[model samples]
Target: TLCGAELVDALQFVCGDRGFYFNTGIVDECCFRSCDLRRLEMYCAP
Candidate 1:
């Protein structure tokens, strides 16, 4: 929710009625998942 929406699209992409999609566009699903770790890193990082 980093939509740090103090100004980060304060009203945009704020998990609204719009359906959220996590579909990948990469050629390999594993590669996409590898990138997923990066996100976790951000979340888990102290």
Candidate 2:
């Protein structure tokens, strides 16, 4: 899945309440400026 900083914001809003935390696989204008094309992922609080 494509990933970006902006996408993370929305994912966090949607998944944060669901008990998921943003997990970046690696370190966006056009989403390629400061973002990576890594997989979108998250982990539950432990």
Candidate 3:
């Protein structure tokens, strides 16, 4: 899971709520920027 600044920045955009990514219809920009390319897919998965 995201932590530190990554967690703080994404905190408001998770679950059923919304934020910056909401502008682009559920984006991965923050996730991509915050997490490693290899780990992104695993982290995003349910």
Candidate 4:
């Protein structure tokens, strides 16, 4: 049961810097699974 605030925090943790760059080592598999893969990949690539 995730709340809006929690989701926002997770998003912030995973998609830091406006989704251009990730902070790294913050999000785990579960959170990652919930995230937008394409967007995450975009950030992952140089």
TM-score leader? 4
What local lDDT score does residue 24 receive in model 4, on the 0 to 100 scale?
A: 52
Q: Give lDDT: candidate 2, residue 43.
A: 34
For candidate 1, lDDT tens digit of each residue in 1-46? 2222232232223433443344242323323233343442332213
* Candidate 1 lDDT for residue 3: 20
**Candidate No. with top lDDT:** 4
Q: Comparing 2 and 3 by lDDT, which wins?
A: 2
Error of 2 at 21 (Å): 7.6
TM-score of each: 0.20, 0.30, 0.25, 0.32
Per-residue CA lDDT of candidate 3, range 1-46, in tens? 4654655454444422322332131135444345543543333324
Model 3 weakest lDDT span, ten residues long: 17-26
Winner of 1 and 4 under TM-score: 4
* Per-residue C-alpha lDDT of model 2 across residues 1-46, encoded as one tens digit per residue: 2245556564455455566554423332324544332233343332
- Report the C-alpha lDDT of model 4 over 3-44, residue by residue, as the tens digit: 445755554576666554435532553355554645444543
Model 2 TM-score?
0.30
Among residues 3 or more apart in sequence or in different chains, the pairs in candidate 3 whose N, CA or C atoms overlap within 3 Å are none
- Candidate 1 residues lying further than 4 Å off, grouped into runs, are 1-35
| Model 1: per-residue Cα lDDT at residue 25 | 29
The residue pairs in collision within model 4 are none
Task: Give candidates' CA RMSD values in order.
Answer: 13.3, 6.4, 10.9, 9.1
lDDT scores in order: 0.32, 0.43, 0.41, 0.48
